[PDB]
Amino acid sequence: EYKDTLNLNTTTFSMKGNLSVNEPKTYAKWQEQQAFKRMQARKDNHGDFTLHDGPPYANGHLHLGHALNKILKDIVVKREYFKGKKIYYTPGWDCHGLPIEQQILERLEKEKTSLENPTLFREKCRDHAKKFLEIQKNEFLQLGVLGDFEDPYKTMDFKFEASIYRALVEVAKKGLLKERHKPIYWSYACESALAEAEVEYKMKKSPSIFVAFGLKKESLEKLKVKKASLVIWTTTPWTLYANVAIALKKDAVYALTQKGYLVAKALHEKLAALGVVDNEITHEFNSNDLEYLVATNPLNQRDSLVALGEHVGLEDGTGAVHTAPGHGEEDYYLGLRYNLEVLMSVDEKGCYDEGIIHNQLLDESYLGEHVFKAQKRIIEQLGDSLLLEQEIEHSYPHCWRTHKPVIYRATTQWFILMDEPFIQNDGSQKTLREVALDAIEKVEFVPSSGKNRLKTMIENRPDWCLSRQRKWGVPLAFFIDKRTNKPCFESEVLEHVANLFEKKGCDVWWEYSVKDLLPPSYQEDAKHYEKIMHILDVWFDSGSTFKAVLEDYHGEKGQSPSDVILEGSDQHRGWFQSSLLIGCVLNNQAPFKKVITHGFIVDEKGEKMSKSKGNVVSLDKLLKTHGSDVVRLWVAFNDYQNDLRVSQTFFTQTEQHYKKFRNTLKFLLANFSDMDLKNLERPHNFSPLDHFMLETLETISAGVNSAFEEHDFVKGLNILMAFVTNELSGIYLDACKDSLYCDSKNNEKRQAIQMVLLATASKLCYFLAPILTHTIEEVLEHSQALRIFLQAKDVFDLKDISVSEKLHLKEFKKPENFEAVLALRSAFNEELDRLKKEGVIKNSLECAIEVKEKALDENLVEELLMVSFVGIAKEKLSETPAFTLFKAPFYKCPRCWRFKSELENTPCKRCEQVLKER
Ligand SMILES: C/C(=C\C(=O)OCCCCCCCCC(=O)O)C[C@@H]1OC[C@H](C[C@@H]2O[C@H]2[C@@H](C)[C@H](C)O)[C@@H](O)[C@H]1O
Ligand SMILES: [Zn+2]
């Protein structure tokens, strides 16, 4: 009957987020009003923070991994902004390379067409990247992320292409860029060399054969046996044509069987059990005595030299290794060590060429045949020399963009050398491997385990092949002097080319003549120079972003080294490594101080998302289903260092966390909305319960901040949520509802409660603003009191506030100790539950309690236990060692529902006064 006489305590801040409607309006506003530039221009910026963006490929729409990545970057950046620092965060895009060029190739072929003109082909590639750079930029902004998205970096900008080339120039001037001729990864489907980061290892079925190479007559006479054939094991019959040698383990015993097969003795038992060779050994020979004997290749009748390899393994195979220098790296060095032929008759498309006829290595019927299609017919040609064929499965290197298996071909390519000493900037002498290992020890990794992942790769990596045979990318734009057959690294030549690139882009490398590309002083000798037309590994491009973005803009986009880079843990094999290596040539240090990694988006069963599996969840679908602030809370509230599973159950839990945060903020705003703002300019007398809350607010704030400092948003959101749920909602807001709703608006106890709620809302806003930025922006939009209190027009004016100073607290005020009264509260609530089960009582306000520890504040007990009366009464309900509960000897007040009225249906003394209010 008196509900209309209570304090309204409502706010326009709504319970329902309606995120699908309101978030795009918030983000459109931040773009229109240039919130990021306003963040950078903030007048009281103190300190600097550079996060250097790793560039996604400008191909396709964003997937959930991009969203994960940019949200985490956004939280880290916003944290530093709200700490008061000046922010540098320029997002960028990877525009070159097969990731763009392959999509153009697949379209041309689907359209049944070709495009041979180099300038036009690069134009199609460039326009494709421009289209999807726009698409990804606006998709990034729909996640609520703030960065220099209107002035991002692009590896396709002419200045950027000049920067990438100038980095290459520094490598070449330091003596680390050299030509090598050796077998390397060859992708026949795109007719290009590859390096490790462009290769994906996948299980693949393969023939597996054991082949007998008979010793030649004179070798049998030297060995003093009638029959002997070395048995090799190989999974690549397509390289048998290129055999020049059979490599044995140094100083090892080889067993000759009765049928005349020669194998490593340590492997004879296994081989006989496989049925490869017979079981009876007749003679044992040391491999040192077999070296320089000669066998015969059964496929083509050619000589094969018996050699000793370095580190021949005896765990698989036969202990005798078919050695093909044109198709294996260790084979190649063995062939050179013995001055043997390098047979390599497989062309760029992976097919046998005329060289099989010229040297008589393989029958003419194989001309033009792809090496992988030829293998079945090769195996049949082996006849009786084939001792056993099996089919096995092994992890095999595949091209990262055509998805086809690679092969190896001896070829001349350009490398960054790992174990080549070079002159350091401080004058000393060190290899790149040594510098990179030193540099890693100075980088902070989050998690720490990332260090040894990257360190192990550096310890084991080979020389870095740089040259690729595609068209879309930055050329290795050096001339070869025909008079010397060596590259021209003259500073005048290199910088002249770099300047042309900066002004017109690398197109001119294909269009201009040699004379036109040479300085005026060299054009009389243009006849002696020839362009290198290979382009750079795209991992060199992105490995150069630190130079093109941080250094070449002299701090305007961040410092080099950056404070933080943040990408998936798959970038130890990619961007972390290439940036580390180039940083170490140019600066002899890593171009980052700290690396934070995250895992991958996976499905509900932790499995990888793929179109073949039909388990891909699109970014659009997820945002539309849940809203970006929920997707952002999902990220921060979960162990993002590992894989994150998408499932209804986990998003339901996050929506429940978001609702609790949002409902709590609504209650706070609603219950200080009527507070006279003059309270903000005067101190108050806070109760012990108020002090307990402010002292608690401080304690958990320190813990949320320490957790967020170490990027452990889970630990920090759990602290924050536990405070919201337990101390705030469960204790304080329950004890306070009566005063808030039923006391006079002039009541100073109520005004002191509102000040605590205002300080609490202020801390919630500060700590959630990096994560739920839209929502905290919406909180300030709906609360004039919060905006005045925090002196904030919008979310970007937020600062960490001193509650002690804003509420005028005395410094040496001793903290509350509520342990004794909270144990009583817990024991009373356990006893009250039992009485409620029995039906004796319905709620705590129906009770009186006499506490047996008389040293406790009686009004605090009434407040925390929500009893209507502290002391003795007449009707005993139950008793414990700690207290005795009674029925409260009053009527329920019709206005406040507390059992404090002396007459039935009559307002209590407090309520009567409030109702008389003049
Ligand atoms: C979290 C990741 C993947 C994921 O989890 O993605 C899974 C997305 C879910 C659905 C899959 C989409 C289609 C599935 C299918 O059909 O196959 C890994 C991270 O990604 C973002 C960033 C990509 C930038 O380019 C990298 C730069 C730095 C370097 C120079 O290249 C980077 O941070 C990366 O490390
Ligand atoms: Zn009352």
mmCIF file of N, CA and C in Angstrom, residues 387-444:
data_model
loop_
_atom_site.group_PDB
_atom_site.id
_atom_site.type_symbol
_atom_site.label_atom_id
_atom_site.label_comp_id
_atom_site.label_asym_id
_atom_site.label_seq_id
_atom_site.Cartn_x
_atom_site.Cartn_y
_atom_site.Cartn_z
ATOM 1 N N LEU A 387 63.276 -56.301 -53.626
ATOM 2 C CA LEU A 387 63.186 -57.400 -52.669
ATOM 3 C C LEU A 387 61.924 -57.346 -51.816
ATOM 4 N N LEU A 388 61.384 -56.156 -51.575
ATOM 5 C CA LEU A 388 60.163 -56.029 -50.790
ATOM 6 C C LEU A 388 59.576 -54.651 -51.047
ATOM 7 N N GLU A 389 58.282 -54.598 -51.363
ATOM 8 C CA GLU A 389 57.540 -53.347 -51.464
ATOM 9 C C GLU A 389 56.505 -53.304 -50.354
ATOM 10 N N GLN A 390 56.468 -52.200 -49.626
ATOM 11 C CA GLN A 390 55.395 -51.937 -48.687
ATOM 12 C C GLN A 390 54.809 -50.573 -49.013
ATOM 13 N N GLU A 391 53.724 -50.242 -48.328
ATOM 14 C CA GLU A 391 53.144 -48.906 -48.354
ATOM 15 C C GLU A 391 53.109 -48.417 -46.919
ATOM 16 N N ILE A 392 53.726 -47.265 -46.677
ATOM 17 C CA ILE A 392 53.803 -46.682 -45.344
ATOM 18 C C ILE A 392 53.140 -45.316 -45.376
ATOM 19 N N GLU A 393 53.037 -44.682 -44.216
ATOM 20 C CA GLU A 393 52.548 -43.321 -44.088
ATOM 21 C C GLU A 393 53.575 -42.526 -43.289
ATOM 22 N N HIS A 394 53.898 -41.319 -43.757
ATOM 23 C CA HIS A 394 54.884 -40.502 -43.067
ATOM 24 C C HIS A 394 54.497 -39.038 -43.193
ATOM 25 N N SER A 395 55.041 -38.234 -42.286
ATOM 26 C CA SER A 395 54.847 -36.791 -42.340
ATOM 27 C C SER A 395 55.685 -36.204 -43.473
ATOM 28 N N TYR A 396 55.022 -35.539 -44.424
ATOM 29 C CA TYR A 396 55.669 -35.099 -45.650
ATOM 30 C C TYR A 396 55.410 -33.618 -45.912
ATOM 31 N N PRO A 397 56.428 -32.879 -46.368
ATOM 32 C CA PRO A 397 56.278 -31.427 -46.576
ATOM 33 C C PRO A 397 55.368 -31.080 -47.757
ATOM 34 N N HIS A 398 54.392 -30.206 -47.504
ATOM 35 C CA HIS A 398 53.465 -29.744 -48.527
ATOM 36 C C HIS A 398 53.536 -28.232 -48.654
ATOM 37 N N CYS A 399 53.270 -27.748 -49.863
ATOM 38 C CA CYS A 399 53.262 -26.314 -50.119
ATOM 39 C C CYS A 399 52.125 -25.651 -49.346
ATOM 40 N N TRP A 400 52.435 -24.560 -48.633
ATOM 41 C CA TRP A 400 51.440 -23.951 -47.747
ATOM 42 C C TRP A 400 50.229 -23.386 -48.483
ATOM 43 N N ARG A 401 50.342 -23.058 -49.766
ATOM 44 C CA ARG A 401 49.205 -22.450 -50.445
ATOM 45 C C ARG A 401 48.614 -23.293 -51.564
ATOM 46 N N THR A 402 49.411 -24.081 -52.282
ATOM 47 C CA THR A 402 48.804 -25.004 -53.235
ATOM 48 C C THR A 402 48.397 -26.322 -52.585
ATOM 49 N N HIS A 403 48.907 -26.613 -51.382
ATOM 50 C CA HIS A 403 48.603 -27.832 -50.634
ATOM 51 C C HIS A 403 49.111 -29.080 -51.334
ATOM 52 N N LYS A 404 49.994 -28.918 -52.282
ATOM 53 C CA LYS A 404 50.565 -30.053 -52.976
ATOM 54 C C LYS A 404 51.891 -30.444 -52.335
ATOM 55 N N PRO A 405 52.253 -31.725 -52.433
ATOM 56 C CA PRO A 405 53.535 -32.167 -51.879
ATOM 57 C C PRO A 405 54.694 -31.498 -52.598
ATOM 58 N N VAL A 406 55.721 -31.123 -51.836
ATOM 59 C CA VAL A 406 56.889 -30.511 -52.458
ATOM 60 C C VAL A 406 57.876 -31.612 -52.817
ATOM 61 N N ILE A 407 58.867 -31.273 -53.636
ATOM 62 C CA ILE A 407 60.005 -32.148 -53.868
ATOM 63 C C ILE A 407 61.256 -31.354 -53.527
ATOM 64 N N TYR A 408 62.420 -31.931 -53.775
ATOM 65 C CA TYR A 408 63.682 -31.227 -53.623
ATOM 66 C C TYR A 408 64.392 -31.230 -54.966
ATOM 67 N N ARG A 409 64.969 -30.083 -55.328
ATOM 68 C CA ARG A 409 65.732 -29.924 -56.559
ATOM 69 C C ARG A 409 66.988 -29.124 -56.251
ATOM 70 N N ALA A 410 68.136 -29.598 -56.733
ATOM 71 C CA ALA A 410 69.323 -28.757 -56.716
ATOM 72 C C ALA A 410 69.058 -27.524 -57.573
ATOM 73 N N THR A 411 69.262 -26.352 -56.982
ATOM 74 C CA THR A 411 68.981 -25.097 -57.665
ATOM 75 C C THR A 411 69.846 -24.021 -57.026
ATOM 76 N N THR A 412 70.093 -22.953 -57.775
ATOM 77 C CA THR A 412 70.833 -21.810 -57.264
ATOM 78 C C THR A 412 69.843 -20.761 -56.762
ATOM 79 N N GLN A 413 69.903 -20.466 -55.464
ATOM 80 C CA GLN A 413 69.024 -19.515 -54.792
ATOM 81 C C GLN A 413 69.856 -18.604 -53.889
ATOM 82 N N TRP A 414 69.186 -17.633 -53.278
ATOM 83 C CA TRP A 414 69.812 -16.631 -52.425
ATOM 84 C C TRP A 414 69.444 -16.906 -50.979
ATOM 85 N N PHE A 415 70.417 -16.761 -50.085
ATOM 86 C CA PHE A 415 70.234 -17.152 -48.701
ATOM 87 C C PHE A 415 70.714 -16.058 -47.760
ATOM 88 N N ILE A 416 70.049 -15.957 -46.615
ATOM 89 C CA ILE A 416 70.636 -15.320 -45.441
ATOM 90 C C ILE A 416 71.356 -16.413 -44.660
ATOM 91 N N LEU A 417 72.668 -16.253 -44.461
ATOM 92 C CA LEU A 417 73.480 -17.283 -43.806
ATOM 93 C C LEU A 417 73.429 -17.156 -42.286
ATOM 94 N N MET A 418 73.333 -18.309 -41.605
ATOM 95 C CA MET A 418 73.169 -18.407 -40.156
ATOM 96 C C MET A 418 74.486 -18.524 -39.410
ATOM 97 N N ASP A 419 75.479 -19.142 -40.020
ATOM 98 C CA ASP A 419 76.732 -19.427 -39.339
ATOM 99 C C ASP A 419 77.890 -18.720 -40.019
ATOM 100 N N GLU A 420 77.583 -17.595 -40.668
ATOM 101 C CA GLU A 420 78.575 -16.735 -41.289
ATOM 102 C C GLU A 420 78.930 -15.589 -40.348
ATOM 103 N N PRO A 421 80.159 -15.506 -39.843
ATOM 104 C CA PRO A 421 80.512 -14.372 -38.978
ATOM 105 C C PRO A 421 80.313 -13.057 -39.718
ATOM 106 N N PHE A 422 79.817 -12.053 -38.999
ATOM 107 C CA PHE A 422 79.684 -10.728 -39.589
ATOM 108 C C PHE A 422 79.952 -9.664 -38.534
ATOM 109 N N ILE A 423 80.220 -8.455 -39.008
ATOM 110 C CA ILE A 423 80.691 -7.388 -38.139
ATOM 111 C C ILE A 423 79.500 -6.788 -37.398
ATOM 112 N N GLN A 424 79.544 -6.861 -36.069
ATOM 113 C CA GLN A 424 78.496 -6.310 -35.223
ATOM 114 C C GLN A 424 78.583 -4.786 -35.205
ATOM 115 N N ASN A 425 77.500 -4.152 -34.753
ATOM 116 C CA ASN A 425 77.480 -2.692 -34.667
ATOM 117 C C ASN A 425 78.443 -2.170 -33.608
ATOM 118 N N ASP A 426 78.773 -2.988 -32.609
ATOM 119 C CA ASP A 426 79.714 -2.564 -31.587
ATOM 120 C C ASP A 426 81.164 -2.886 -31.951
ATOM 121 N N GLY A 427 81.414 -3.397 -33.155
ATOM 122 C CA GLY A 427 82.758 -3.695 -33.603
ATOM 123 C C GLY A 427 83.162 -5.155 -33.504
ATOM 124 N N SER A 428 82.405 -5.981 -32.784
ATOM 125 C CA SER A 428 82.812 -7.363 -32.562
ATOM 126 C C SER A 428 82.363 -8.257 -33.721
ATOM 127 N N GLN A 429 82.649 -9.551 -33.600
ATOM 128 C CA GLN A 429 82.440 -10.510 -34.681
ATOM 129 C C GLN A 429 81.625 -11.689 -34.164
ATOM 130 N N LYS A 430 80.480 -11.944 -34.799
ATOM 131 C CA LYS A 430 79.536 -12.964 -34.353
ATOM 132 C C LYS A 430 78.731 -13.460 -35.544
ATOM 133 N N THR A 431 78.292 -14.723 -35.477
ATOM 134 C CA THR A 431 77.353 -15.244 -36.460
ATOM 135 C C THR A 431 75.929 -14.810 -36.115
ATOM 136 N N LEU A 432 75.052 -14.886 -37.117
ATOM 137 C CA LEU A 432 73.655 -14.536 -36.897
ATOM 138 C C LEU A 432 73.014 -15.486 -35.892
ATOM 139 N N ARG A 433 73.332 -16.782 -35.983
ATOM 140 C CA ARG A 433 72.799 -17.733 -35.015
ATOM 141 C C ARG A 433 73.178 -17.318 -33.603
ATOM 142 N N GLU A 434 74.446 -16.935 -33.406
ATOM 143 C CA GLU A 434 74.901 -16.507 -32.090
ATOM 144 C C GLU A 434 74.184 -15.245 -31.636
ATOM 145 N N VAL A 435 74.018 -14.269 -32.532
ATOM 146 C CA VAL A 435 73.365 -13.022 -32.139
ATOM 147 C C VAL A 435 71.911 -13.283 -31.771
ATOM 148 N N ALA A 436 71.211 -14.070 -32.594
ATOM 149 C CA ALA A 436 69.799 -14.348 -32.335
ATOM 150 C C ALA A 436 69.606 -15.068 -31.001
ATOM 151 N N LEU A 437 70.497 -16.012 -30.666
ATOM 152 C CA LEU A 437 70.381 -16.707 -29.383
ATOM 153 C C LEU A 437 70.606 -15.755 -28.212
ATOM 154 N N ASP A 438 71.623 -14.886 -28.303
ATOM 155 C CA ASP A 438 71.804 -13.846 -27.290
ATOM 156 C C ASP A 438 70.567 -12.958 -27.180
ATOM 157 N N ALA A 439 70.036 -12.511 -28.322
ATOM 158 C CA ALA A 439 68.924 -11.561 -28.318
ATOM 159 C C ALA A 439 67.691 -12.153 -27.643
ATOM 160 N N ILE A 440 67.459 -13.452 -27.841
ATOM 161 C CA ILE A 440 66.291 -14.124 -27.268
ATOM 162 C C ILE A 440 66.323 -14.067 -25.744
ATOM 163 N N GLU A 441 67.517 -14.185 -25.149
ATOM 164 C CA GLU A 441 67.641 -14.165 -23.696
ATOM 165 C C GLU A 441 67.269 -12.823 -23.079
ATOM 166 N N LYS A 442 67.116 -11.766 -23.878
ATOM 167 C CA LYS A 442 66.722 -10.452 -23.380
ATOM 168 C C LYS A 442 65.249 -10.142 -23.621
ATOM 169 N N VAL A 443 64.504 -11.055 -24.198
ATOM 170 C CA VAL A 443 63.099 -10.818 -24.496
ATOM 171 C C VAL A 443 62.266 -11.503 -23.427
ATOM 172 N N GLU A 444 61.230 -10.816 -22.965
ATOM 173 C CA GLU A 444 60.270 -11.406 -22.049
ATOM 174 C C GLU A 444 59.191 -12.128 -22.852
#
